[PDB]
């Protein structure tokens, strides 16, 4: 049989890299993998419906990145009861809710997202120096576990830092236009803002455009997360200050490998057993300076 992967979306580069990484790993393992996302973008109910349709196609295993912590709880529990080998990718499902629903997953593969936020905020703190300044966080969608961890890690770092004042922490729901809108509002209400940490690059690129439109490119630091090509290009060009790169290809490849390796014991993970927890490294991408 084959394996299935349900991602948040296939239109955005972070997730496209994850799909490509899954396929590269499938090519090394010699397994067949179908990778999907639901047509309605960001629709948690559409993604549930997609998951439910796949869970009835006799896949050996399904890896999934849920759009929210709760939207896939019931169909994941249902698949576990059917003996499906399940791997949570990237964004943490509500595991206590999953257990209450009667299910489990073999593994969760993710980035240390508290560390991501701490790195993004930490680089801002380093770049602002002793004088510090007003900073803001553009959050992902409220309640998404990975985004929440980044907000926590950044907020904690900013709170401890001398002369840093976090003046705004606001969701833009992983959306570039909405992040441009939120950044425009922050720039209007906080004309002394010195830096904005953004929970992903889709948002950071919108923020960078708001900063440019305000004539403030280089005057307001903009840090993203994911490391998508356009953000790495923005960092090179000075349009973004940095981005905390993730490795979506490795997240996907590792999740597929865990799903394949899980079947060797001939049974899905017991209900009372803790899933595997596999961290994939992040890396701060800054403007490459070799000039003394
Ligand atoms: O889909 C929006 C975002 O979801 C997070 O959970 C992922 O780690 C990436 O940052 C992605 O860009």
In sequence order, which residues have a C-beta less than 8 Å from that of residue 252 and are 6 or more positions away?
A: 5, 17, 18, 19, 20, 21, 22, 25, 63, 89
Domain boundaries, the chain: 3-105+248-279, 113-245
Backbone φ/ψ region at 218: left (φ over 0), alpha (ψ -120 to 50), beta: left
Using an 8 Å Cβ cutoff, are 253 and 22 in contact? yes
CA–centroid distance, residue 265 to ligand 1 (Å): 32
Cβ pair 58, 4 in contact under 8 A: no
Q: Which atom of ligand 1 is nearest to the CA of 145?
A: 6
Say what the alpha-carbon torsion angle 155, 138, 228, 2 is, to the nearest 10 degrees. 90
* Mutate-to-test residue for ligand 1 from 64, 89, 174, highest number of ligand atoms within 8 A of CB: 174
Label the pairing between strands 221-226 and 193-198. Answer: parallel
| CA–CA distance, 253 with 265 (Å, rounded to integer) | 20
> Domain 113-245 carries which CATH code?
3.40.50.2300
The answer to whether the CB of 46 falls within 8 A of the CB of 52 is: no
Which among 26, 34, 32, 25 has a CA at the least distance from the CA of 53?
34
Backbone angles phi, psi at 85, to 5 degrees: -85, 115
Would you say 34 and 2 are in contact if contact means Cβ atoms under 8 Å apart? Answer: yes
CATH topology (fold) of 3-105+248-279: Rossmann fold (3.40.50)
Q: Determination method here?
A: X-ray
Tell me the CA–centroid distance for residue 174 and ligand 1, in Å: 7
Cβ of residue 226 lying under 6 Å from some atom of ligand 1: yes
CB distance 113 to ligand 1 below 6 Å? no
The Å distance, Cα 171 to ligand 1 centre, comes to 13
List the resolution, Å: 1.6
């Amino acid at each position: 049989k084959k394996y299935a992967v349900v991602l948040k979306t296939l239109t955005d580069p972070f997730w496209q890299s994850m799909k490509a990484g899954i396929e590269a790993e499938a090519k090394e393992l010699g397994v067949t993998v179908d990778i999907f996302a639901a047509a309605s973008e960001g629709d948690a109910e559409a993604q549930l419906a997609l998951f439910e349709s796949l869970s009835n196609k006799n896949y050996k295993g399904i890896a999934f990145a849920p759009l929210t912590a709760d939207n896939l709880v019931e169909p994941v529990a249902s698949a576990w009861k059917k003996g499906t080998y399940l791997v949570n990718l990237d964004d943490k499902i509500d595991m206590k809710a999953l257990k209450a629903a009667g299910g489990n997953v073999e593994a969760f593969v993710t980035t240390d997202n508290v560390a991501v936020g701490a790195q993004g905020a930490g680089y801002i703190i380093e770049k602002l120096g002793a004088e510090g300044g007003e900073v803001a966080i553009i959050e992902g969608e409220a309640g998404n576990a990975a985004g929440e961890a980044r907000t926590k890690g950044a907020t904690d770092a900013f709170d401890k830092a001398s002369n840093i004042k976090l003046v705004a922490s606001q969701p833009a729901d992983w959306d570039r236009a909405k992040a441009k809108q939120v950044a425009t509002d922050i720039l209007a209400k906080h004309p002394n803002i010195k830096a904005i940490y953004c929970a992903n690059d889709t948002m950071a690129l919108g923020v960078a455009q708001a900063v440019a439109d305000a004539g403030k490119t280089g005057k307001v630091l903009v840090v993203g997360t994911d490391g998508i090509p356009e953000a790495q290009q923005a960092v090179k060009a000075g349009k973004m200050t940095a981005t905390v790169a993730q490795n979506p290809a490795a997240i996907g490849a590792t999740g597929l490998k865990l799903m394949v390796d899980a079947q060797k014991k001939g049974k899905v993970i017991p209900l009372d057993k803790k899933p595997q927890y596999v961290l994939v490294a992040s890396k701060l991408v800054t403007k490459l300076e070799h000039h003394h």
